[PDB]
Design a protein around this nucleic acid. Structure first.
Length: 63
DNA sequence: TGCGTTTAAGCGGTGCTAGAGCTGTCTACGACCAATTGAGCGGCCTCGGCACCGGGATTCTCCAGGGCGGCCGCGGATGCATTAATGC
């Protein structure tokens, strides 16, 4: 099983971590950076999607 | 813009201590590689959401007729000029 499931995170911690590793950012990356990044992206995406869905539903649309 | 004044920074100088800066040490702690499988992903075919127009109710804008105080066409005078029969 992946850490995202045991941490209840929808976004992939492993994918973010491997993006950071090959993203020429720092040679040493702690385990907290990928989980923090996944959490913040999940929060931002959730808020944006909720607002967009509100804007869609107030215009008689389901998309 | 110009002036009297007054509240006030700029400045010379001190004693420190909370705090910035360089240095061993080990101890957490991640870099890297067999090995797997399981979730991300390529492809597909459909029905429900969506695109666009119809029929009226509704809402919006915009048209003209009617009662308000000043008008510019006209007619006649009666003077300016002309004119013809007659006394001289």
């Amino acid at each position: 099983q992946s850490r995202s499931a045991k941490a209840g995170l929808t976004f992939p911690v492993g994918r973010v971590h491997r993006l950071l590793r090959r993203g020429n950012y720092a040679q040493r990356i702690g385990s907290g950076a990928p989980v923090y990044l996944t959490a913040v992206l999940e929060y931002l995406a959730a808020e944006i999607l909720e607002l967009a869905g509100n804007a869609a539903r107030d215009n008689k649309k389901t998309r």
